[PDB]
Amino acid sequence: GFLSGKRILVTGVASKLSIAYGIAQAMHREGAELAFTYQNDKLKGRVEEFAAQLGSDIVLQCDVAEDASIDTMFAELGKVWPKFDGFVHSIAFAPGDQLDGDYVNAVTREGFKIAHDISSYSFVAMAKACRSMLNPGSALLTLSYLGAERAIPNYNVMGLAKASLEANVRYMANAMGPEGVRVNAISAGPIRTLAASGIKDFRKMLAHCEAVTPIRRTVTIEDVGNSAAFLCSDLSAGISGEVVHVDGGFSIAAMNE
Amino acid sequence: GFLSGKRILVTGVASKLSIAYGIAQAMHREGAELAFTYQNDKLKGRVEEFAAQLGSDIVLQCDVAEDASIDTMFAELGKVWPKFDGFVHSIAFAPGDQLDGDYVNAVTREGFKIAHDISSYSFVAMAKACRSMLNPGSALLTLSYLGAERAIPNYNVMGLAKASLEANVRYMANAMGPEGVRVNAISAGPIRTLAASGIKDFRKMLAHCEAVTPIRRTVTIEDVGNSAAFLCSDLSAGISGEVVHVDGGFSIAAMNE
Ligand SMILES: NC(=O)c1ccc[n+]([C@@H]2O[C@H](COP(=O)([O-])OP(=O)(O)OC[C@H]3O[C@@H](n4cnc5c(N)ncnc54)[C@H](O)[C@@H]3O)[C@@H](O)[C@H]2O)c1
Ligand SMILES: NC(=O)c1ccc[n+]([C@@H]2O[C@H](COP(=O)([O-])OP(=O)(O)OC[C@H]3O[C@@H](n4cnc5c(N)ncnc54)[C@H](O)[C@@H]3O)[C@@H](O)[C@H]2O)c1
Ligand SMILES: Oc1cc(Cl)ccc1Oc1ccc(Cl)cc1Cl
Ligand SMILES: Oc1cc(Cl)ccc1Oc1ccc(Cl)cc1Cl
């Protein structure tokens, strides 16, 4: 595959529905060697199972909330991969109470803090910790959402954390470009996953993008995987600091009845 | 003036070079009752003098890093202005060690948290505490910078705080819109203010700017003040959730010399 000889670290796999899973699966198919990380003991087991199915045995614990967790994880990976070619950042969170009802009433100082910490800072924190481990031609990828560009109901504070994420992509790309590292983000459309259920009225938010999206269907984790495999391959050598929308054109249309 | 009959609260006035100062002169010029706030006692004096010249003896203290300080401030203000027509958010901050050098190396979890808290969250925090005191037709204004749109050297983490800030403007305007409140932002070009010296290489970041800018000069707190006065008056009742560029058209040009 166009990803042979590459060693990429994939994070955020929680179930077969996880987007990171569609990404791992697609990269595996293109010949890359994968590495996985799990947040806690609750997920360890299923991640080891998935890693096995994808011919990998490197499964490390990592909570982007603590710099120590990140340093230990990368120091453990370095034992098998003195150097690798980038990682997929598919992590996000915000207390549930934040994603329900009026934005101004729901948002709090703490919720805001948590959302920005786990969903935007963790991306650079990881890059900082493995910077000297990355080979030239490496790519770093994160996953954003339209909420970053437009104001979407109930998405609330996450929207702000994502705008911050996308800005991160541009500052990271510009900072690491000379060393030969590329940084991009995929702005995926609504997908039926596990964390997608935390957003109030989601079953409807999908049926909307359904009949309004140019391609007349929502994207699948497969659609996203293919785009991430590419954005992480040497085929996208000229793309950096970009946020490409993989939503089937939903964002470039307006008032489709 | 076009602001007669409007009561506006202005924050961020530190010297005569402050943008917030330029904004207050214009509004008062357009016939507007003003109220000023100061971060700490070190500035209490200056603010009182400026407030006197602008026909105002309402000078409250307020540290956006504290929910309680924001609560008391509007509690005090409520004694004179049981209801007012909005405020101008001219507040931003980040530890100096975040604003110099390679972004990936400079950024820290602490620096990130603070920058987003003071420069972005405070804006919505203020709206929470005075939401019931606003009249229909009120206007909220904040200040941003092109760093939220592009990767600009040394601006580093402040660029991510601003993107969050600009997204905050869209989420706030969408939530408060049905209440007759408009929320907008002005993306200002480089101005010689008291906090501008805090950015690594600014005098040269200003010398370059006034050379490649369509209007061939850097904006002044006057140009900003005037646009601010307009964005807060009923004259701009058709604008909400917008980020207007008051930078002489610099952001639209490319490759000049
Ligand atoms: N689902 C969508 O429609 C959609 C659309 C656009 C973007 N995204 C983004 O895709 C990414 C993944 O979301 P998802 O849809 O696959 O949901 P998901 O529930 O399948 O996975 C989310 C992951 O976040 C991980 N995580 C949470 N906190 C963590 C922490 N502190 N440390 C390490 N890992 C942590 C979880 O463990 C989990 O694996 C997110 O960035 C998300 O916002 C999703
Ligand atoms: N200077 C520029 O060229 C420029 C360009 C675009 C946007 N802006 C923005 O304009 C705004 C004002 O900056 P400025 O250039 O007038 O510098 P300034 O030094 O004149 O004012 C900055 C203000 O921030 C206030 N502040 C900081 N921490 C605070 C806190 N915890 N609580 C309450 N107030 C606090 C300061 O006290 C001060 O008044 C900022 O949002 C800034 O980023 C400035
Ligand atoms: O960003 C998202 C956008 C969509 Cl349309 C659906 C799910 C998304 O992802 C999340 C939303 C809230 C929390 Cl707390 C965690 C995650 Cl992973
Ligand atoms: O945003 C700004 C943009 C420019 Cl060009 C000049 C000054 C700016 O304002 C700040 C920069 C850094 C810190 Cl710590 C605080 C403030 Cl108020």
Structural domain spans, chain B? 1-257
* Resolution rounded to one decimal, in angstroms: 2.5
Q: What is the DSSP letter of B120?
A: I
Report the top-level CATH class of B1-257: alpha beta
Method of determination is: X-ray
CB atoms under 10 Å from CB of A222, counted, come to 12
- State the Cα–Cα distance between residues A51 and A43, nearest whole angstrom: 12
Q: How does strand A7-10 pair with strand A59-61?
A: unpaired
Answer yes or no: do B104 and A112 touch at CB < 8 A. no
Using alpha carbons, select from B128, B113, B118 the residue that is nearest to residue B39: B118
Nearest to A164 among B127, B160, B170 (CB): B160
Active-site residue, B171 included: no
Residues of A in contact with B150 (CB under 8 A): 170
Q: Which helix (H) or strand (E) holds B10?
A: strand B6-10
Q: What angle do CA A193, A199, A205 make, to 5 degrees?
A: 80
Q: Output the DSSP codes for chain A.
A: -TTTT-EEEE----STTSHHHHHHHHHHHTTPEEEEEESSHHHHHHHHHHHHHTT---EEE--TT-HHHHHHHHHHHTTT-SSB--EEE------GGGGSS-HHHH--HHHHHHHHIIIIIHHHHHHHHHGGGBPTTEEEEEEE-GGGTS--TTTTHHHHHHHHHHHHHHHHHHHHTTTTEEEEEEEE-----SGGGGSSS-HHHHHHHHHHSTTSS---HHHHHHHHHHHTSGGGTT--S-EEEESTTGGG-----
Q: List % helix, strand, coil for chain B (3-state, nearest 5).
A: 50, 15, 35
- State the Cα–Cα distance between residues B85 and B99, nearest whole angstrom: 35
Answer yes or no: do A128 and B109 touch at CB < 8 A. no
Active-site residue, B145 included: yes
Residues of B in contact with A64 (CB under 8 A): none
User: Least CA distance to B122: which residue of chain A?
Assistant: A109
Answer yes or no: do B103 and A172 touch at CB < 8 A. yes
**CB distance B176 to B139 below 8 Å:** no
Q: For A191, phi and psi rounded to 5 degrees?
A: -135, 140
Ligand 3 neighbour A152 (Cβ under 6 A): no
Nearest to B104 among A148, A160, A172 (CB): A172
Residues whose CB falls within 8 Å of the CB of residue A202, separated by 6 or more in sequence, listed in order: A190, A196
> Which of A69, A142, A149, A171 should we substitute to test contact with B (largest number of B Cβ atoms within 10 Å)?
A171
